[PDB]
Structure 1
Amino acid sequence: NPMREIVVKKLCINICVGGDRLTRASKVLEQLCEQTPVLSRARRNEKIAVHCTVRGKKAEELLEKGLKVKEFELKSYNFADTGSFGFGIDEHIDLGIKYDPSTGIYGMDFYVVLGRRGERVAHRKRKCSRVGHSHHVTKEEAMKWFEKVHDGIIFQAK
């Protein structure tokens, strides 16, 4: 069935600055995603982090770049029971950067949400319900998808 095809729903690039450092992170993220990010609030109400949400072909291109950065360094525990996985590649300069001396190197933290088509059922306003459990992406299905993309799953514990 063509409706069981696993696709990428989003990439969630996140910078956790924990002032001008957060501004440099915001500028870098905007230059890296062609899209204005949103600052986060901690919890006491200061801005701690900067994150963005990427979709479409921009998200797929960003995933290709970040995957090349890590060179297929996806351990098994990187994957989740929701069918999602992520990885953190430090020094964004690995992906094409300009190294403006005003904003130094920065450890972007990529995260990938893999899901199947038809998930609107759980997020639409009218008639919101639950996707059937057969239609959910599993850990194994995410494994198969990744090993089809770029490979490199080596088992670990910690």
Structure 2
Amino acid sequence: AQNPMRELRIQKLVLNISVGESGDRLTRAAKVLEQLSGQTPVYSKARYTVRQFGIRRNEKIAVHVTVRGPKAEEILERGLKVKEYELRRRNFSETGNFGFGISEHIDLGIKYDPSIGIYGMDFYCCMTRPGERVAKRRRCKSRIGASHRITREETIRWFKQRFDGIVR
């Protein structure tokens, strides 16, 4: 229970901008993600066509990026400043992951370039404990123990203890 190998850690933070249309808007959204993260973002195509969404199959409609390490903690804490360290209880998943979404990227500290415009973001934080390599490695891949899996209540407690957040 109090083992040093049971500490909750941020496995990754995934940043998503789903524009819903291809072209210059998606290019500028990818520029926003590249400027925020420091890495090359990856584009996401539509896997099937919807008529009244205005999208078609094999059309790039979204962009996303994954950050790990202290950079993920920094960007997540900036987003938590934007959300004023207040998340509703439904934002925490049953497996112990969480996430939220901002409506504009200027509040993270990015300057407003008139060429780029206004884009919002989806932040998703995936949490692990040390020992996830058991399920992610190639040779002798196994399953994480039930006592080692993260609980939604443990994630909520970790959030309220580290970030001084108000889960309500």
Give the alignment's TM-score, normalised by structure 2: 0.90
Instruction: Name the count of aligned residue pairs.
Output: 154
Structure with greater proportional helix content: 1
1:31 aligns with 2:16: no
Identity score, percent: 68
| Distance in 2 of aligned mates of 1:116 and 1:42 | 33
Which residue identity does 2:97 align to in structure 1? S
Provide the aligned C-alpha RMSD in A. Answer: 0.7
Where 2:123 maps in the other structure, the secondary structure is strand
Is 1:54 the counterpart of 2:56? The answer is: no
**Hey, what does 1:69 align to over in structure 2?**
82
- Residue 147 of structure 2: SS of its match in structure 1? helix
Match of residue 123 from structure 1: 136
**Residue of structure 2 in register with 1:13 after alignment:** 15
* 1:96 corresponding residue in structure 2: 109
SS of aligned partner of 2:12: strand
Match of 1:85 among 88, 98, 114: 98
Specify the alignment match of 2:118 in structure 1.
105
Instruction: Give 1 or 2 for the bigger CA radius of gyration.
Output: 2
Kindly indicate whether residue 45 of structure 2 is the aligned counterpart of residue 41 of structure 1. Answer: yes
What are structure 1's unaligned runs of at least 5 residues? Answer: none
Shift of 1:73: 2.3
- Residue 97 of structure 1 deviates from its aligned partner by 1.2
Which ranges of structure 2 fall in alignment gaps of 5 or more residues? Answer: 48-56
Shift of 1:34: 0.8
Where do 4+ consecutive residues of structure 1 move more than 2 Å? none
The code of the aligned residue for 1:152 comes to: I
Measured in 2, the distance between the counterparts of 1:41 and 1:122 equals 28
